[PDB]
Structure formats: structure tokens, C-alpha cells
């Protein structure tokens, strides 16, 4: 499964979570930004690696980073 | 002579001799099977009769265009293969006949999809049956005419032996 | 022209070098 | 032109963007960097340029070959 990391440059704009096609990211409470929220990656087993999450990231060099790793039938997007 | 498919306008439920008035459902299914098989074979036979008469590309020409004459000219080892193919087809049809919900002439298994048949389906089945009946009469006439006169269909028509 | 003995013993020595190769191959593990 | 197409067809956008980065560094060093920031052609546009050049080169080669051959003889 791929690896997804969140960095404290998160501004809690939720654009990553609402762009994930496989429900990998979610918004959790935080105290490091104005919005009081930070993205989390608790379901990386469903991560497919499409990187839509970091295409919607407005922070300078990203706050969500996807590191491709071992492959799985879920991560390979295999309907068969 | 029932609610069976095949009743057309000129003679609805055409059983003048009452063959179906006394038969049970099994005998009527047998009659429908025989009628449909005869009709299909006769349609094929009529089409082959005509096409063979004006086109016989196989066997490097030869195989005289008059039917009932090419019947005795096929290598007789091609006759065996046609016979075996028909036999295998009818073995498969026999195997079909024991499938649940089987209908007399239905070898496509349309009963699987067609529950509560429409009027279009009944009309198309009647069309097939009527074309088969016309082809049975036509092929009987073809064979009899070729036997008594010796000329084929388009040959007798062309000369004017009518 | 080389003889049958010359080619035969070269083939035999080549076999010995083959058994030494699989031993190295198997020692470099599966 | 047909061989030129293969540069766009075989390569990718990241390499050209990172090369444009160093070219832009040189321009900034000489105070001549344009205000309109130079970016490498998008992936779809790279494919479109590649296919257009490929078609032009191949069709033009066949065009010249056919015309010269059939006019000479």
C-alpha cells in the first residue's frame, strides 16, 4: 500500500479530503492553523496513488504527500 | 387447433380433419415439432433448389444444375458428412428437448426470456410457420414437377412448360 | 583438425566448470 | 520534422520544466526573465505537438517521394 503523510503546513482547506476518490483522507481537529483542522490519512490501505489529493493542495510545496510503495489489488485499482 | 401459435386469417385453427381435436398435449407438441422441422427443412430445400439451379460454384462447376441429378453426383463422401452433421444437430436438439420448460419447436430456448409473450412474438412465430408451410408446398411441387417433366424450376419456367 | 579425445575432455572439463557455476549460483542464494 | 516529433512523443514535461528552470535562472541572472513565466508545454499539448509533427513529417515524406517519383517517370 502507498504511504500518505500530512505536514503541519496544512491550512485545513479540506480540498484534499473532498478530492480523494477512495476515502483515504479525513479532516481531524487541530490547533496549528486558523481553521483548527488538519488532514489525516487513516485509510491508506485504500490509497490508489492517483495523487488527486495533492493536486488540490494550495500550500506552497504541498501539505499532503503520497509516496508510492508496495502494490495491492486495492492500490492497483483492479476490479478483477 | 388450440391457443397454439400459427393461426392465421385465411383459416383460423385449420384442422378440417380433426387431427388435434382428440390428441392430448404431448401428441400436439409432437405435431408442432414435426411441422416446424418440415417447414425449416423445406425453406432450406426451396432456397437450395433455386440457387443451385442458377448458381453452383462448388465442385469446380460440374454437378449439373438440375436438382435430383446433382443428388447422384456429389462425391458420396460429402453426403456422409452432411448426414453426420444433421445427425449431430438432431442429437443436440434431442438433448435440448429434456431441458426444463422446453417448448415444441423452440431450440433457441426463448422460453427463458419470453414469459408473457407479446403479439409481436406470436406474429413472428406465425410468420415462420406460414413461410415453412408455403415452402413445404413449394418443395413438394418442385420435386414432383422435376420428376414428371425432367426440367428444373427456372428451366421449365423459361421454356414455358406450364 | 582436433581429435575426438580433445573435444571430449574439453566437454568433460566444461561440465566440471558447470558444477562449479551452480555451486556459486546456489551460494549466492535463491 | 518526423524525427523532431519523437522528442515530444518520447519525452515528458518534468524534464523540460526543470531545464526551463535553469534557463530562467540564467535570464534572471541577466535581468531578462520575462514577466510571462515560461512553462513547458502541457502533457496534452506535448502529445498534440508530437502527433502533429509526426503526421506532418510522414505525410510530407510520402508526398515528396510520390510526387518526385511519378513526375520523373
Amino acid at each position: 500500500s502507498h504511504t500518505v503523510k500530512i505536514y503541519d503546513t496544512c491550512i485545513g482547506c479540506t480540498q484534499c479530503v473532498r478530492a480523494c476518490p477512495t476515502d483515504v483522507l479525513e479532516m481531524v481537529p487541530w490547533d496549528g492553523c486558523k481553521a483548527g483542522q488538519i488532514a489525516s490519512a487513516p485509510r491508506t490501505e485504500d490509497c490508489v496513488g492517483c495523487k488527486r489529493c495533492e493536486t488540490a493542495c494550495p500550500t506552497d510545496f504541498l501539505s499532503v504527500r503520497v509516496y508510492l510503495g508496495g502494490e495491492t489489488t486495492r492500490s492497483l485499482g483492479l476490479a478483477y | 387447433l388450440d391457443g397454439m401459435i400459427g393461426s392465421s386469417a385465411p383459416f383460423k385453427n385449420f384442422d378440417p380433419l380433426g387431427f388435434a381435436a382428440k390428441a392430448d398435449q404431448k401428441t400436439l407438441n409432437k405435431y408442432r415439432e414435426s411441422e416446424l422441422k418440415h417447414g425449416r427443412v423445406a425453406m432450406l430445400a426451396v432456397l437450395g433448389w433455386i440457387v443451385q439451379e442458377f448458381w453452383h460454384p462448388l465442385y469446380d462447376g460440374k454437378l449439373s444444375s438440375n436438382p435430383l441429378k446433382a443428388l447422384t453426383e456429389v462425391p458420396l463422401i460429402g453426403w456422409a458428412q452432411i448426414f453426420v452433421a444433421i445427425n449431430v444437430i438432431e442429437y443436440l436438439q434431442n438433448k435440448i428437448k429434456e431441458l426444463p420448460g422446453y417448448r415444441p419447436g423452440d431450440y433457441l430456448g426463448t422460453w427463458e426470456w419470453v414469459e408473457q409473450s407479446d403479439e409481436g412474438w406470436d406474429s413472428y412465430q406465425t410468420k415462420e410457420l406460414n413461410n415453412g408451410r408455403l415452402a413445404m408446398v413449394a418443395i413438394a411441387g418442385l420435386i414432383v414437377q422435376d420428376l414428371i417433366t425432367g426440367q428444373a424450376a427456372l428451366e421449365q419456367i423459361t421454356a414455358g412448360n406450364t | 583438425m582436433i581429435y575426438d579425445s580433445q573435444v571430449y575432455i574439453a566437454l568433460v572439463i566444461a561440465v566440471v566448470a558447470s558444477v562449479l557455476a551452480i555451486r556459486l549460483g546456489a551460494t549466492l542464494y535463491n | 520534422i518526423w524525427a523532431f516529433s519523437l522528442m515530444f512523443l518520447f519525452s515528458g514535461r518534468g524534464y523540460w520544466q526543470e531545464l526551463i528552470e535553469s534557463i530562467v535562472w540564467a535570464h534572471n541572472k541577466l535581468k531578462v526573465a520575462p514577466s510571462i513565466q515560461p512553462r513547458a508545454l502541457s502533457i496534452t499539448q506535448g502529445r498534440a505537438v508530437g502527433v502533429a509533427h509526426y503526421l506532418l513529417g510522414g505525410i510530407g515524406t510520402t508526398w515528396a517521394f510520390f510526387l518526385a517519383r511519378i513526375i520523373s517517370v
Binding site: - | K95, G109, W113 | - | -
Partner: protein, 171 residues
Amino acid sequence: VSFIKPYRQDPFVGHLATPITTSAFTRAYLKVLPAYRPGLTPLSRGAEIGFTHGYFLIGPFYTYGPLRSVEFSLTSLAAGLLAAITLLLILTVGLSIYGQVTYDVYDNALIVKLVRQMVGSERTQDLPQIKGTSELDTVLGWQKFSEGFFSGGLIGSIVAAVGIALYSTYL
């Protein structure tokens, strides 16, 4: 009427009930084939499949091989027969390795019920799972299937060679 419907009333399968997938002709024709004919042991299925396959495999090798002959030649027939037999050997090798790497079962249609009843808390894929309940889906079943394929292929190739020789000589 409509002649295409979802397969077995499941609109989510990647399949359809067309006049070809689920027609009575298709049902009977596939049920008379050796792979699905009822009452056949896996050895019998393999033997019939091998016989038919060698029988029709000797044809192209003999007719279009490297040693053809517009007349009848014993060398051409022998070449075609040997090529067909070696191709059957290659196919049997493929069958053997496929069965070796695919199944780990010796008696199917039971282990599935045993693990659906007496629990399967093990390494799985042998107790649990198990795709297919046919006798062909076992280590023993596939081994006998390959053996039958190989023997029947040899016999059918020889029979077809004899038939070809008879047809070319006496006709």
C-alpha cells in the same frame, strides 16, 4: 419481448443473459462436451479431449509442414505425427505445471462444507476459499486429467494418421 436480461437476476455481475450465453442450444451443446459432460471421471474427460485434440492437430502439421507432399508420403505422415505428438507433450507439460501451481486439494465438494461448518481458522486458501467444486479442481483430479489428455492425444494422433493414410491410399 426482450432477449437480453441480467444474468440470474443480478444486475451487478459483469455478465448478461443473451441468446448465446444462456440459450438452450448453448446449454445442451456445452453439456455434451467432455469438459462439462455429466458422468465422466477426470481421466475420461482428459482422454476424450486429448483424442479430439491430437486428431485435429495432426492435420495442419502433416498438410503444411516442412516435409509436405502433394502425393501421399510416409515421411510426411511420420513428420506430422511426430510434430503432433511433441506438441501434445508440450501441452501436457503445461497442464502438469499449471495443476501443480494451482490447486492444493485431493477431494473437493467436501472441504468447502467442512470449513463452512467446522470453522477454518488456519492459513486459508486450502481449507477456506477453494474456487470451484468440480473434481477437475483438485491435485489428483488435474493430474489424472493431464494423464488422460496425454494418452488420448497419442492415441488420437495415431488414429488420425491411420485414417489419413487410408484416405490417401484407397481413395
